[PDB]
Symmetry: C2
């Protein structure tokens, strides 16, 4: 390469590195390509050959302030030098973790009061499950334990959290989903069975199907419902009109807890600080990760509504100290990154930019490719957008999955210097740019996307 | 305090910080104390009041090179500046992650070939479960899925990983353990039912009970057995003579995979680089975390034996790209810390020191308190030690748990400037000092421990 130190990186990578979300065989045998990333600034990343790309996916919906922000790197460095680690067990902490909990609560919807820290969105949803079950056992409701998720939801990659996930990739050959997880309708207007339904009618159909599930299972057995405000990995799918209002009316009716999974939406991505506030969701638990630190250091959170919190306190008074902890819960360099990141989001006015430049980006994408014969839909909200491809628009005929149309378009786009993502379980090109994206950078992404679409379909 | 910036830290902590392994109510209401940690060097830590302590528990068995090692802090800082984050999905990586995978394999038992990175020991055991089930589905053995753990084992704090854990604190009110986890005998000679058994006879009894379980359940249904080489959180309990030899003979007989959970033992703690090598364990999967980075940044690993790996590759050739990933898998600042840490372990000759000064420490502790009327046992191996208290030694009468004798001794010790841990589910004072501990520092820990024992029991 140009920037590598070792001359052995390909051999070591292929011989010893078991990558997430990679084909083990093609990688090991040298059949699939690899990319060793070296640097970045703003919206630009580069590899160890020095090849540059505009990263219109911000890593994985996570490098929200953009790359190379030395304020956050310096915050990490300072904490790493002073005290990289001590535990947060039995009332131990650092100034950074205590300060961050306060900052998160200030930004969260009113009525939120406590934050429990982890390392990944998956562990935060794991914590949620334990809390939901603990809460119901404390209340003397041992049967109230089932958790309703949704098809195409993404909630993590563990055993229980992969069960919550509603995408087959995270289930097949892993013996998931496991009880007591259930899945209701995908909140996905474009793929509705009855095309005569308006958005609000489809939202009511989803609410009605949730109600039927709750009643069939026994409401006394349903503990919680989990949803992303807008689907991330399940296709960059904003909720249809009326959805959150109607779903919440059903949940309230049967005393079902609401978990808003804000791993993608937390801290500004939609042009509002929280996605729950953006869509009028009043949750009991909020999952956070990714944009909490702009991925500068790993960190997750569970934000707990005060009414749930008070029950947890009653539980501790009967049962004692909580049987839940991660060694690296509240890890000092990670919470330090979170403090710096949240200040930087405000200083750079990125919540405003995400909404305003996000709207511009989405409008421009619609103009550029929405008219194409093989573009079924351009959709999104804030700084999230997707282009979904179809074989026939009038009759909504999808391409056979074997054709890999989504991947073809993402590959063409990448070759032209722009990173977007071919989403799973469809032909969908997704975008989640850093929240600092300028209009001029948006224009480049849109132009190259039109070139990539034209190329694949001509 | 002396070192705090904000004058609001107590209020914020109690009002907003949901700590791991803490009583929610006492913490919230201001009834239990808190400690805000500020700094450290070597074996000494201090809080934001400037109060110093010798940390004879190295955080949580994890600050292995000791505190304030600027080599590792600088490595983190450099990576954070250059590229704090990019994903490792679809064959993406960094020089740091690729280099670390190679370094881990070099140090691991021969026959190990791949490493999958995570953030916590709990997520590494989660990955293990998914791999075990995937492996058996690929082999056409859909019924071969049960996982045998052990009472008093510690394997993490999730739903599935808390199920693997064999300590009640991680089960009660959380509806654990869940199928298909089973628990066999605690590998705990001091508490054997039949006191006439020698260590080797007790080891054979444990092997026989494992065999009976396997046969009762149906060997065709048992996928794996998981164990720490020496129990950490379950009481600092070395395996009895013959244990690992006899257990492995049973597992081999029924084609059961062996997972060595080395979250505590990995990277030198026993005076050997791996605990598996220390006790003659030949595992199929190795869990690592804690000492992998000396906790300077969060990081976990699953080390995969090449024979298991080859089956996984056959699976990818049939099923495609792996449906498993954490956003922060192979997080660049975390793998950078791991590279620096492993070099520092060698440079400071800490594997040697852990064995040699660990043996000295343990001998000195035995001389100082082993003769006390209320000390049932002083035990340990390498740089791990424990003192277990009893009400009557001859008749092995334990104190009532309500008396909190273990906590009393740990509290007295702390008041004298030394941090050890009152272990769960017993009266046991545990030690896991940094691997750089000197003989002179050992002497201080031993002396203060004798003072603390004498004080509680007089």
């Amino acid at each position: 390469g140009m920037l590598n130190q070792s001359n052995e990186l390909n051999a070591w990578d292929r011989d010893h590195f078991f990558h997430p979300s990679t084909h083990m065989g093609t990688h090991a045998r040298g059949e699939s390509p690899t990319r060793i990333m070296a640097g970045g600034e703003g919206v630009t990343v580069w590899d160890n050959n020095g090849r540059k790309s505009i990263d219109a996916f911000a890593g994985l919906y996570c490098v929200n302030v953009g790359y190379g922000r030395q304020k956050i790197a310096d915050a990490i460095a300072t904490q790493a030098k002073n005290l990289a680690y001590y535990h947060a067990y039995v009332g131990h902490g650092t100034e950074a973790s205590i300060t961050l909990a306060k900052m998160i609560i200030d930004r969260a919807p009113k009525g939120m009061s406590r934050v429990y820290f982890g390392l990944s969105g998956s562990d935060a949803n794991e914590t949620n499950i334990k809390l939901i079950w603990y809460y119901n056992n404390v209340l003397g409701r041992p049967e109230k334990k089932k958790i309703i998720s949704r098809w195409r939801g993404y909630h993590g990659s563990g055993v229980m959290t992969g069960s919550l996930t509603g995408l087959d990739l995270f289930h097949n050959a892993f013996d998931l989903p496991r009880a007591p997880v259930l899945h209701t309708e995908a909140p996905y207007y474009f793929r509705r069975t009855d095309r005569s339904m308006s958005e609000e009618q489809f939202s009511q159909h989803c609410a009605d199907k949730l109600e039927e599930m709750i009643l069939a299972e026994g409401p006394e057995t349903i503990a919680a419902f989990i949803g992303e405000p807008i689907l991330g990995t399940g296709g960059i799918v904003p909720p249809p009109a009326g959805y959150w209002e109607k779903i919440q009316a059903v949940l309230k009716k049967y005393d079902v807890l609401l978990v808003a999974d804000e791993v993608v939406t937390g801290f500004g991505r939609l042009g509002t600080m929280f996605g729950s506030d953006h869509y009028g969701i009043k949750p009991d638990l909020i999952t956070i990760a990714k944009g909490l630190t702009s991925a500068y250091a790993p960190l997750s959170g569970v934000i707990v509504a005060d009414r749930v919190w008070q029950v947890l306190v009653q539980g501790s008074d009967k049962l004692g100290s909580l049987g839940h902890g991660w060694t690296y819960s509240a890890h000092p360099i990670c919470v330090a990154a979170g403090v710096a990141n949240l200040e930087l989001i405000d200083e750079m006015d990125l919540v405003t930019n995400a909404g305003e430049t996000g709207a511009y980006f989405r409008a421009e994408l619609a103009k550029a490719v929405g008219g194409h014969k093989n573009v079924g839909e351009v959709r999104g909200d804030g700084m999230l957008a997707a282009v979904e491809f179809v074989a026939d628009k009038d009759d909504r005929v999808f391409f056979d999955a074997s054709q890999k149309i989504g991947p073809q378009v993402a590959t063409a786009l990448a070759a032209s210097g722009v990173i977007g993502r071919a989403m799973p379980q469809g032909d969908i090109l997704g975008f989640a740019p850093p929240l600092c994206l300028t209009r001029e950078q948006a224009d480049i992404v849109v132009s190259k996307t039109a070139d990539a679409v034209k190329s694949v379909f001509a």
